[PDB]
Design a binder for this molecule. Structure first.
Ligand code: AMP
Ligand code: PAU
Ligand code: PAU
Lengths: 253, 256
């Protein structure tokens, strides 16, 4: 009975896993700066403890603590950090702790979910992160880029004439369009940023395949994966619980 | 005998050129915005132009600053601010609403049409944003796309994440120089630098291959802007470097 928390820069994801690490309850809530509400932990049993992954800063760390203290007073909690090696995975970062804890947990989750496979993990959040993971557990390196939403948001705030589009709006725009090349501003913007994601991933995957001279499964995770997958001309696999599954394994050990 | 002053004002820098004949760029330069502590252009050695032709995508404040700079240096100088048209100088605007196309992209399209006669083009321009335009040999601008630039991508990561710092292109380029650059990185600043850069290159390569496959004909990739050098290294496909596209377009407009 462990509570797991995946705090990112855009929102805070949580889950409750039993003895068999089955995520019996899941949920998500936004940050206070974005008018985010609190999580509904009313119909939730008292966990033995809480395991936290937080890359969203000290204020979020404090808020999470307050939430736990309000619901379950004095609940045991642990904030995880990236380790040189853990749960079958080795950290290839020159300075292992520098790696985002969410990326670390996701690696641990992916290692278990796809045993005996080389992987390219594409996670779509505030940032788009890529990780190369060998079957033997070796995390050999990665890439970091802004996510689809962030790219368009950046265009809207740092130019005078470009509109600020949400992924909801952007996704609908591309649905009615017929290809990277568009004949209007919001579609050019939406397609330009989307194919920056697809182009990044596709180039990385072919680079990884050519480097390891072996099959590599491309794993996609995150809400934006839906829209990015539709532009991909290479095979891909969806798996949206890698981070929370990893936290379960970390909590279990 | 009368020279033309050409202004290309973007969201990051304001580029200018003094032009002779049809499109001969005699003097050139650039300067930053007031909000960035940018200085004023050195026009102290320039003769009085016949007029100024301006492309501005950076708003009314910048437009007012440019007018003020011109009024101070050359009082009474005629000025023209350009807007994207349905068709001009051999180029046909494929935009649903032609006027919505960035005037800098329009001028650049006009310059590319003249600079590469008889060729199908993919134009990659690197500024605050990275913009692509597909241009037919006959002059048909059939479509394009807009993505954030290399610097903007990293700035966005720096401001909207708690644990990532902001890297400049100078810092990123220095960290990725030589054997430092890899398909994947093992530290945060290089992973950040490479990820955004490979997003640039990846975007261009994807759009280029799709265009060639679509038109089923040769397509010349043309690069313009400051970040082009770094992006070029990341490219595995061939490319042509041609930075004066926009200023040449303005010159051709001013000559006509
Ligand atoms: N792309 C262009 N090329 C040449 N002249 C232009 C262009 N855009 C605008 N102008 C001129 O600028 C003035 C004002 O333009 P507008 O505000 O669009 O009516 C008019 O004299 C137009 O003919
Ligand atoms: C890159 C993000 C913001 C993506 O969530 C996060 O994983 C993070 O803060 N990482 C720290 C820097 C690094 O992973 O190299
Ligand atoms: C895309 C930028 C910002 C590049 O300078 C500029 O060309 C612009 O403001 N364009 C307006 C929208 C469009 O060109 O479709």
């Amino acid at each position: 009975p462990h509570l797991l928390i995946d705090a990112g820069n855009s929102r805070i994801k949580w889950a409750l896993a039993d003895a068999r690490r089955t995520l019996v309850d899941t949920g998500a809530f936004g940050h206070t700066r974005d008018g985010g509400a609190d999580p509904d932990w009313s119909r939730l049993p008292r966990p033995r403890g809480a395991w936290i992954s937080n890359v969203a800063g000290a204020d979020v760390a404090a808020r999470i603590d307050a939430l736990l203290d309000a619901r379950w007073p004095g609940l045991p909690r642990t904030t995880i950090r990236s380790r040189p090696a853990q749960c079958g995975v080795t950290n290839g970062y020159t300075t292992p702790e520098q790696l985002g804890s969410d990326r670390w947990a996701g690696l641990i989750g992916a290692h278990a979910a796809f045993p005996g496979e080389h992987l390219l993990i594409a996670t779509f959040g505030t940032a788009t992160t890529l990780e190369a993971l060998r079957a033997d557990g070796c995390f050999t390196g990665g890439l970091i880029a802004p996510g689809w939403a962030l790219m368009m948001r950046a265009l809207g705030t740092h130019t005078a004439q470009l509109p600020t589009l949400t992924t909801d709006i952007a996704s609908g725009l591309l649905a009615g369009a017929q290809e990277p090349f568009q004949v209007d501003t919001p579609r050019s913007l939406s397609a330009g940023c989307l194919y920056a994601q697809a182009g990044l991933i596709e180039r990385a995957w072919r680079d990884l395949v050519a480097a390891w001279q072996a099959p590599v499964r491309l794993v996609l995770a995150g809400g934006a994966a839906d829209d990015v997958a539709r532009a991909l001309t290479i095979a891909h696999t969806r798996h949206d619980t890698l981070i929370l599954s990893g936290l379960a394994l970390i909590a279990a050990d």
